[PDB]
Amino acid sequence: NITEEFYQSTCSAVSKGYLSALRTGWYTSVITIELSNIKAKVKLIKQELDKYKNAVTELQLLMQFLGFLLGVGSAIASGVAVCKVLHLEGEVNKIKSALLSTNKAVVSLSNGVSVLTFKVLDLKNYIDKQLLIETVIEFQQKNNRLLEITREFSVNAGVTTPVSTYMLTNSELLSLINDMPITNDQKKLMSNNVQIVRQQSYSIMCIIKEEVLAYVVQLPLYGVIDTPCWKLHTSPLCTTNTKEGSNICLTRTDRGWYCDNAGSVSFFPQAETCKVQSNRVFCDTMNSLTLPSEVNLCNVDIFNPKYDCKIMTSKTDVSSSVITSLGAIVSCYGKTKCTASNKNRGIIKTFSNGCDYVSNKGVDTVSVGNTLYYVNKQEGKSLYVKGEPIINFYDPLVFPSDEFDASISQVNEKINQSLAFI
Amino acid sequence: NITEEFYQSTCSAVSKGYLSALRTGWYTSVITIELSNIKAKVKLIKQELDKYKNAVTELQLLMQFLGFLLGVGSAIASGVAVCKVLHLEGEVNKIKSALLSTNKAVVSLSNGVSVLTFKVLDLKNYIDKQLLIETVIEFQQKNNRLLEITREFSVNAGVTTPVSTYMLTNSELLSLINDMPITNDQKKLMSNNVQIVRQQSYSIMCIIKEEVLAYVVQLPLYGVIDTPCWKLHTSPLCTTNTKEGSNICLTRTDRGWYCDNAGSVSFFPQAETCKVQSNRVFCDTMNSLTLPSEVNLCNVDIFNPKYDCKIMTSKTDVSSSVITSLGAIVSCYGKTKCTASNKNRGIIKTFSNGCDYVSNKGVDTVSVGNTLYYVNKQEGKSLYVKGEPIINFYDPLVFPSDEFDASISQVNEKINQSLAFI
Amino acid sequence: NITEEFYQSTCSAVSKGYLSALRTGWYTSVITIELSNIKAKVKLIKQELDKYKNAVTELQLLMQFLGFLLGVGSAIASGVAVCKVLHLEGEVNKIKSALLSTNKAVVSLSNGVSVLTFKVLDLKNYIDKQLLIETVIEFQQKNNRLLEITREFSVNAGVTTPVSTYMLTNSELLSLINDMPITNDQKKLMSNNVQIVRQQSYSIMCIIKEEVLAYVVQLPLYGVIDTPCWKLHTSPLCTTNTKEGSNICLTRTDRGWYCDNAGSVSFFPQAETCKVQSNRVFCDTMNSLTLPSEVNLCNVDIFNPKYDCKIMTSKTDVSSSVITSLGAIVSCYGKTKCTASNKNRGIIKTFSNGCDYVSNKGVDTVSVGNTLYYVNKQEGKSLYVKGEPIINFYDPLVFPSDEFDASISQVNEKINQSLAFI
Ligand SMILES: O=C(c1cccnc1)N1CCN2C(=O)c3ccncc3[C@@]12c1ccc(Cl)cc1
């Protein structure tokens, strides 16, 4: 299921076996709260009603390495577009109308957007009936929900994420998912991962008008599902000569998540925009580059003539470890002490100067200098691919050593150039 | 009102029409909570009083591209300076004294700071009266506020932001703003944008002593208001030759917010330190550089002899889009599919290799590779300024291609140098 | 106690006098909540019981400059390893068993991990007794705690930090610390800084099975305590020639926290991974490099032959200030206005072009351009170390000016090279 290959020649490892779930688009729903325009166990409701009035008062005052290659989006542009529609005249009344005999209804907005509208709290109907037994309790439980939505919007300037359980309860989110217009695969994936959906959603406050509070919930559309994904971990590969500062180093800069998508590979350079759940990888295509699938060739052979593998160079031989999915890459240089230990037995391997790797089978921790790393202890097979470390192929006298946005061919050109002068 | 110019020659766009609101300084107020030193409907207050004692117990245990050019400040240095004063002897008693007959009072501290002090909760007076009818309810509502302030300080190590509605209610914040010593313009701007004020404020726990809990609220001073602001969006400008990796690229690195300020331009390289509300731009001068106004000349003519426009160079021709205020810049290179669509009609434009631009009029989404971008759908006019793309002016054989902290003149010097050798 | 030296020659300052508290490892405890499997003042408990059932329902659906040199760890790898054990059969029942006659017990898990288990809420025993007077109140207070833990896990995908006061109360955290297996020094340091401990902890949801909710709390182990620490502040050092863009600049890139640790120095390049409490510095060794102690020699003499001091170079002479522990470094260049003021007296010093420094004694604010900086007003002595600014030692005609990952020797080599050609 989950497997891993370490490449000794380029000091990198590839974890495969994952399945994708990529946010490719947004769904926008309009959540509504109908409000009231009002001015022994009684005095309980007295303050509960002052709380209500203030919440409305408060709401109305309110409504007055390679990541640099990414483009720049506007995350809530679609949601805010729907908000601007809800300010047109009659547009709020059109909604209030549709949600008259039911909580859930689909409405066609004037600019031609079909949206799932949803009345999750009907305070108006509640207040203008009872407040004009358990009815004290239920008012507090619904009022408290109103106060919390109010709290959230007024410390986040009307835009919140993840969408809290007060903005949209589980039972509400689940049925919203079900009433959505998506495939059965998408419905199940969202239903079985609602905490992730919550984290990739936005809650946007739109309007208070005509006794209605309206906010858009902006939900993720996963248009790519169950394609193969793999994570690339890289570490500095340096020479290990004796005289200090006479060493040269080289790191693959294309680390991150890689997912097959529509004939290409989606690449996510900041592997923190992606959230892994078991063997499923939730990513957002806004944080990706679209590369040719040939990019995968860089792991097998970094000198392949089909794709120009990206690297940076330096003279900075510092030690560090990279904790992978199924093991640990260790770059030990200079006088650093680098080890790996079993939980009960102690040190089992001492690393030499160079870049090496150890799997999580039998290993619980790795130490580099004064830094303790615990390794992920998930089941999976690791393969160690022996190979000559490519930094040995370069003459230090003509090596370009501050290249960052570089590649194999750019380094080869700089070398060929400075070598020709000689 | 909001307008936009795209510059085809340098692959950048400028959105203008915004008005500034820059945090230039801090106001520090001392919020107080008077506490009590104490050891049928009755048993309600019993646990409500145990909650109180613990909160106090708990509080006392508690009280035992170009962003790298920015300097480094200490955000709460002014607030903490006031805290250190409140530990001097008599200094707390001086406050307790002033707030004896009113909730709001201005006190002169011994080190010569005139501060707006504010007793927002008087538990002492409440407890040592009633707890020695609705009085169970009001105790819970004030106690709950105490527990929440306690919660916040003890997960944020005594420093919180944005300042929550428990630290300072709307009604309290509003009158605090009104009793403040600032201009009527500043008062209105803060009153009409209290959620933004909250986000730019700090809450700093100072002391528990002599039955008083004291925290400083650190509020923003907007010393620059209603000056013109404009946002600069830039994208990679590359050549589009057929043989891959034979292309050269160039990006303007001075993207961010620009605001006229006191004869100069304040420049905010990380356009996320700035929050836009309609056409108003809230920035913080701590995250800015002060540039000559001549920096604006880089948009009209990037080769102007008055200011040295900053760029970076590469060989990395990857596709990406930049979503602007009123449209979209698209950098399409290689085999990438780049389009723009109308919401109901589908693809309306297919982009060629190069850097191009489309406005948000008639356009709802832009696609680059596997990445869908929604465009901002705000009203405004866009102007497309036709011009020869400057990367065509360079000979690829003598082009410096890993420059990051570069500029037009630095690139010209490197070229002139390597050309002279030839 | 806290002291500071500014080095005029390299435009940097060192704040010393701090004591370390480094997170070197993790302790993992298993917090449990025993649940119930169930289907006048009465109707209070009715909804309180529906809340309970849902929380369980909801939980079960749920359970279906130099920072780039750092390695990459997996912060909760140890905690999650314990979670995977708690899914083995009998493993939950082994715990439920041990916590039968007490809230606190140490259990040996099957894979040989001795963990402090802790039953912080016994709803089962409570529900299956009473709910089959004040007992309405206590149920609400314990139920509310259950709902909040539920809230937190379901917006954070089961992993929370800082560990909230609902996950683990103060009284619980304190005794957990006391029952822990650590030194008396560690116990006192944690007890006296529980808000910091909270911030460096993780709460990981593990399992619902056999009427038990289990989450791991992952607590910090401070294996290095009371070693000397010092912070290095650096600023751009530029020449100040008249013709613009004819100037060369140089910045020490090794700014951050430095702490003596086990014969070496732990270096924290991102001085925000470290939290200072008075004169104590809480760091995490995962965000550090292990350097030779000789790295300290770079402050006294940057040209020392024992360690190769790291720098970057540019032509970008922009003004900025760096607020230190006890003063302010100012880099004033070009036409920028740079001053320092006393709180009541006004401007007291106007800075010249160059890099200069002023202490916090008599000084309250510093101004660079349109940017106001407040200085830290803590007691301590500053020493100004006069010295020739090293950028004057370089010939601008052969100066390498886009070096970022550079050093004194690398710059000297580039110079020696381009000078030999001449
Ligand atoms: O980060 C900096 C930098 C510079 C000055 C002051 N503070 C930081 N630099 C300059 C050169 N650089 C590296 O060698 C490097 C390595 C890993 N991440 C970022 C960088 C980078 C860089 C960043 C973006 C691009 Cl397009 C190109 C290079």
Short mmCIF file of N, CA and C and ligand atoms in Angstrom, two decimals, chain A residues 65 68 312 402 404-405, chain B residues 65 68 312 404, chain C residues 65 68 312 404-405, ligand 1:
data_model
loop_
_atom_site.label_atom_id
_atom_site.label_comp_id
_atom_site.label_asym_id
_atom_site.label_seq_id
_atom_site.Cartn_x
_atom_site.Cartn_y
_atom_site.Cartn_z
N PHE A 65 10.85 24.76 -1.27
CA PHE A 65 11.75 25.72 -1.90
C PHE A 65 11.10 26.50 -3.02
N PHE A 68 7.74 30.12 -4.50
CA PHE A 68 7.71 31.44 -5.11
C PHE A 68 7.29 31.42 -6.58
N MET A 312 19.54 23.39 -6.33
CA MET A 312 20.28 24.56 -5.86
C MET A 312 21.66 24.08 -5.43
N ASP A 402 26.23 29.43 -5.55
CA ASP A 402 25.18 30.18 -4.88
C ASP A 402 23.91 30.12 -5.72
N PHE A 404 20.42 29.17 -6.77
CA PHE A 404 19.23 28.70 -6.08
C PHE A 404 18.12 28.26 -7.03
N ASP A 405 17.75 29.13 -7.96
CA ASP A 405 16.73 28.76 -8.93
C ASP A 405 17.37 28.05 -10.12
N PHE B 65 7.97 39.52 -2.65
CA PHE B 65 9.37 39.16 -2.84
C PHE B 65 10.32 39.91 -1.92
N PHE B 68 12.15 40.69 2.84
CA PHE B 68 13.37 40.52 3.61
C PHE B 68 14.11 41.84 3.84
N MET B 312 14.03 40.46 -10.74
CA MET B 312 14.79 39.22 -10.62
C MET B 312 14.79 38.55 -11.98
N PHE B 404 18.39 37.62 -8.05
CA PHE B 404 17.14 37.81 -7.34
C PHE B 404 16.99 39.22 -6.76
N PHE C 65 17.10 34.59 8.32
CA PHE C 65 17.59 34.33 6.98
C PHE C 65 17.89 32.87 6.72
N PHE C 68 16.14 28.07 5.99
CA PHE C 68 16.06 27.05 4.96
C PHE C 68 17.08 25.92 5.16
N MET C 312 25.44 37.84 3.54
CA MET C 312 24.89 38.03 2.20
C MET C 312 25.34 39.41 1.72
N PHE C 404 23.77 35.34 -1.49
CA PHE C 404 22.90 35.22 -0.33
C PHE C 404 23.38 34.15 0.66
N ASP C 405 23.61 32.94 0.17
CA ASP C 405 24.10 31.89 1.05
C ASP C 405 25.62 31.94 1.12
O1 LIG D 1 15.40 34.00 0.73
C1 LIG D 1 16.23 34.73 0.23
C2 LIG D 1 16.61 35.99 1.00
C3 LIG D 1 17.52 37.02 0.46
C4 LIG D 1 17.88 38.18 1.27
C5 LIG D 1 17.33 38.29 2.68
N1 LIG D 1 16.43 37.26 3.22
C6 LIG D 1 16.07 36.09 2.42
N2 LIG D 1 16.88 34.34 -1.00
C7 LIG D 1 18.03 35.02 -1.93
C8 LIG D 1 18.67 33.83 -2.61
N3 LIG D 1 18.08 32.95 -2.15
C9 LIG D 1 18.47 31.59 -1.75
O2 LIG D 1 19.57 31.08 -1.90
C10 LIG D 1 17.24 30.92 -1.12
C11 LIG D 1 17.06 29.54 -0.56
C12 LIG D 1 15.72 29.11 0.01
N4 LIG D 1 14.60 30.06 0.01
C13 LIG D 1 14.79 31.42 -0.54
C14 LIG D 1 16.14 31.86 -1.15
C15 LIG D 1 16.66 33.19 -1.73
C16 LIG D 1 15.69 33.29 -2.94
C17 LIG D 1 14.22 33.61 -2.71
C18 LIG D 1 13.26 33.75 -3.88
C19 LIG D 1 13.79 33.62 -5.30
CL1 LIG D 1 12.74 33.79 -6.67
C20 LIG D 1 15.25 33.34 -5.56
C21 LIG D 1 16.19 33.20 -4.38
#
